Design a protein around this ligand. Structure first.
Ligand SMILES: Cc1cc2nc3c(=O)[nH]c(=O)nc-3n(C[C@H](O)[C@H](O)[C@H](O)COP(=O)(O)O)c2cc1C
Ligand SMILES: Cc1cc2nc3c(=O)[nH]c(=O)nc-3n(C[C@H](O)[C@H](O)[C@H](O)COP(=O)(O)O)c2cc1C
Ligand SMILES: *C(/C=C/c1ccco1)=C1C(=O)NC(=O)NC1=O
Ligand SMILES: *C(/C=C/c1ccco1)=C1C(=O)NC(=O)NC1=O
Ligand SMILES: C[As](C)(=O)[O-]
Ligand SMILES: C[As](C)(=O)[O-]
Lengths: 313, 313
């Protein structure tokens, strides 16, 4: 058995990709993700100018997942754009480029320059509206009027299909409002659910200390902690956005977890924490495990079960 | 070594209590909590009139925690007031009564009636502003203006010290706003952080089905999933509300987990999912495990380490 997605006028070998921020900062990282068996890759969220990020330690992992306060760090937009325009081998797999400007004007500036490269090469924009680790600059998609302004301005400057990296929500009214804002924008063709569960806090009992340095130890959560939250957000936006794709992200360590994301509605499945911890070998494992679950159940295609999670009575 | 606390004009043998909703709905449940080694108990959140709650199954537990959509179920306010007035043995431990009206008016109606019993018996009010399982009635404390209205009306009607059960927040701006609301009310003497992480979704891979019946499977998360979220909220409010007490709730299975809550700023420590799964014998275990950690560290009292989590640099 194999798989075949045809999403966003691109062909994908399988639904797996990295999560933005993991194994995708440097040229070396991007070449490693390209050489892996993932179906696609996404670059690290960038600002217009290069930045260093927050002070170390800024990422820590544990048996149930990870906490991070990475904050700015990226080589800057010029580098990721060059990667997209001159360096990426599109014959190997599709590329997504993630942007996370600090203001609407910064995002607009970047997308005006990305557009020609999108037209020429087919790089796909993921607009990050959910970073939980910039002090003073909370998650844009938690402010629905701000979200609307960003999407209006980006859609007008960019003019081409794009997607949005969403924070998790926890309230039905918020699902309803958020999805309705997204559905105002026809150029938003995919929605990635979710970014990290923001501003958790891990404490080490022995040392009586937080484990990351920035923001008094507060950071976004990934990994096993977040799987039910991720699944809820995938399914909530899958139900509410029938004319868009939903990409799942959060808590994927196995083909079974991927299967659950796809049952909830996911088209592509992104891997963050588990990829940071296991490395890019994880992609052959996840595909082998997903194909085995499909074979046991008699599923030949992803379409046979995507979004087909059952409810009770 | 000592687990004793003296707070809110009451003496507690230890900081442990049930979380509202767990082992506290019937008279039988309340007697069993009273008979346990807990330092206190809290009654099931009540509405003015009795309710049945949502269709079953409405609670499920897993190795990493639980999901629930209990929704309304309670014997009604009259029953819990009667228990406070006539049945509870205050010589054994203090009682908290949780209320969760569906409107500000219903809450106000209850607290007007509670007030004389609080005064006479010393029962303590916990006002629930965070239930994630009523369709059309999202978490009140996610709407800061609604929160303020409720606290103003309840403060005026009740006129006595009370506490509030808060939802988890995920955004620094939300912590700042929420705490500033709470700090407008001097009668809010304690803040319980946190209620369930709302609107998660658990899916069973074999059956391809959600595991609870209401709300298409969506429900609030407890247990191991939520400990870093709970610690963050406890510390965020501990830092922002220096004139109030913070009670910790979320993810407690061990004395070590309780130690982390206390380092983060918790006074009382509430136990939901783990008590639902293990039963009331958990409180002797939690006490022994917390005293073991204190002995190893040389700590003689809770106040020697409460709120003393260390940050880096
Ligand atoms: C070290 C690290 C850095 C991250 N940086 C970004 C980022 O640049 N852009 C972004 O959209 N998400 C970022 N994220 C969030 C992840 O893309 C993903 O949404 C999150 O980790 C949850 O998925 P998981 O449970 O597989 O980790 C980052 C996560 C980690 C762990
Ligand atoms: C079966 C069940 C019923 C609950 N009912 C209530 C409730 O009536 N009032 C309330 O404030 N919280 C209620 N909760 C939330 C818990 O008090 C607690 O905040 C949550 O379960 C997180 O703690 P934990 O990680 O120890 O489970 C309920 C939780 C469960 C599991
Ligand atoms: C923040 C995004 C940061 C960034 C820096 C340059 C451009 O964007 C993060 C995010 O979105 N999710 C995370 O879990 N961690 C982050 O630091
Ligand atoms: C909802 C509150 C239910 C209630 C019933 C009578 C009055 O209020 C819940 C809550 O606060 N937390 C939960 O985890 N579960 C609930 O269903
Ligand atoms: C995320 As990296 C460039 O330290 O593998
Ligand atoms: C050495 As290993 C845990 O990458 O099999």
């Amino acid at each position: 058995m194999c798989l075949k997605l045809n999403l966003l006028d691109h062909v994908f070998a399988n639904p797996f990709m990295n999560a933005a921020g993991v194994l995708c900062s440097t040229e070396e990282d991007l070449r490693c993700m390209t050489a892996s068996s993932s179906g696609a890759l996404v670059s690290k969220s960038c600002t217009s100018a290069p930045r260093d990020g927050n002070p170390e330690p800024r990422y820590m992992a544990f048996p149930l997942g990870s906490i991070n306060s990475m904050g700015l760090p990226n080589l800057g937009f010029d580098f990721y754009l060059k990667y997209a325009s001159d360096l990426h081998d599109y014959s190997k797999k599709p590329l997504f480029l993630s942007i996370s400007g600090l203001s609407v004007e910064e995002n607009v500036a970047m997308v005006r320059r990305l557009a020609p490269v999108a037209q020429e090469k087919g790089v796909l924009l993921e607009l990050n509206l959910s970073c939980p680790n910039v002090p003073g600059k909370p998650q844009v998609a938690y402010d629905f009027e701000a979200m609307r302004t960003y999407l209006q301005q980006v859609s007008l400057a960019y003019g081409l299909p794009f997607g949005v990296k969403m924070p998790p929500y926890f309230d039905i009214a918020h699902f309803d409002t958020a999805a309705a804002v997204l559905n105002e924008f026809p150029l938003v063709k995919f929605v990635t659910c979710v970014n990290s569960v923001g501003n958790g806090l891990v404490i080490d009992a022995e040392s009586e200390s937080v484990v990351i340095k920035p923001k008094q130890g507060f950071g976004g959560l990934g990994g096993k902690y977040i799987l039910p939250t991720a699944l809820a957000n995938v399914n909530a936006f899958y139900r509410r956005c029938p004319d868009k794709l939903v990409f799942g992200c959060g808590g994927v360590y196995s083909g079974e977890d991927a299967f659950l994301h796809i049952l909830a509605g996911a088209s592509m499945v992104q891997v963050g924490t588990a990829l940071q911890e296991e490395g890019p070998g994880i992609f052959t494992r996840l595909e082998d495990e997903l194909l085995e679950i499909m074979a046991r159940k008699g599923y030949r295609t992803l379409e046979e079960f995507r979004g087909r999670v059952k409810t009770i009575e």
